[PDB]
Amino acid sequence: VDTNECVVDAGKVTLGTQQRQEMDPRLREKQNEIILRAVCALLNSGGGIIKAEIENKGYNYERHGVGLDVPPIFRSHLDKMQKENHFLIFVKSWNTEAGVPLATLCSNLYHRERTSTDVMDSQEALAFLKCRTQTPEGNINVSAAALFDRKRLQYLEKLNLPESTHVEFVMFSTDVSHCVKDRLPKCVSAFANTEGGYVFFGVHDETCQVIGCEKEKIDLTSLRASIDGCIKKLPVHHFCTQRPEIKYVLNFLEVHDKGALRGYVCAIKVEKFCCAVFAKVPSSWQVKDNRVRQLPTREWTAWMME
Ligand code: NA
Ligand SMILES: [Zn+2]
């Protein structure tokens, strides 16, 4: 995202509700993300102008609409204009809007309530950080503990353990390495930032039935390694002196059917964390040295703490 009085060039974009509906999805998402990062940078850099070349001929803003997906909190800071094949976005300074020091596309601080794991919005993130910085408790879920260390389950058995603040069920995807790399950071962030809990990979959430990953698609010792590497890779911010690593425990449960081993469930208990666990670096941006730049976790947190 090039900078060029702060003018940000977002490149070529397709415009219009219908036109963006029908366009290539990966390109649609890429353009929307370029625009949003440019918006976030300018909100955090005193405002500016985004310019973009409209690539679909015959585009007319008043009849066709825009078709970009923008967080509603950001919309009050934006104006938009079409001038022939060019599109302009007027971005006004964030200016401590909503009591949050800076604009953020995604805090990447997850939390869990009942059966739902969700990312914290900026105000939730701020309240969470303020609580964790000011701090200075029994079994988390014994039914889940009993399930966690079992050696074997029956294919398609329905578990009596329900999902809850402390229990999440997640399906494996076909590429289990991508499954863990994409989903586990959110689960670990959420459990560490909430009350701790257990995630069972290979259990279908809507039915609570044991599925497992086919044994031919799993190498146990390397999956255990990759889970450890995923968790060690998670950004954290401490307000404490001891600064412990995230604590977790992993067990592989065998899934049997018709008297043969068929697959595995991956059970992970994540302890409640002293401070903050991020699924990945917060998605917050600024203009710096004539470039759109993501804030490091430490800088984002420091700005958040005022
Ligand atoms: Na156990
Ligand atoms: Zn800590």
Author numbering: 7 to 10, 13 to 144, 165 to 334
Which sentences from the paper describe this structure?
The Schlafen family belongs to the interferon-stimulated genes and its members are involved in cell cycle regulation, T cell quiescence, inhibition of viral replication, DNA-repair and tRNA processing. Here, we present the cryo-EM structure of full-length human Schlafen 5 (SLFN5) and the high-resolution crystal structure of the highly conserved N-terminal core domain. SLFN5 binds tRNA as well as single- and double-stranded DNA, suggesting a potential role in transcriptional regulation. The N-terminal Slfn core domain (residues 1–336) is followed by a linker domain (residues 337–552) and a C-terminal helicase/ ATPase domain (residues 553–891).
To gain high resolution structural insights into human SLFN5, we crystallized the SLFN5 core domain (SLFN51–336). SLFN51–336 crystallized in the space groups P3221 and P21, diffracting to 3.2 and 1.8 Å, respectively. The structure was determined by SAD using the intrinsically bound zinc ion and was refined to a resolution of 1.8 Å. The crystal structure, at a resolution of 1.8 Å, revealed a highly conserved zinc finger motif. The SLFN51- 336 structure depicts a horseshoe-like shape with a mixed α/β topology consisting of 10 α-helices and 14 β-sheets. The approximate dimensions are 63 × 40 × 25 Å with the inner tunnel measuring 18 Å. The SLFN51–336 structure comprises a zinc finger motif with the calculated anomalous map confirming the presence of a zinc ion. The zinc ion is coordinated by a histidine and three cysteine residues (H266, C268, C302, C303) that are highly conserved throughout the entire Schlafen protein family. The electron density for residues 145–168 could not be traced, indicating that this region consists of a flexible loop. When comparing these residues in the crystal structures of SLFN51–336 and rSlfn13 to the active sites of other ATPases, no explicit structural similarity is evident.
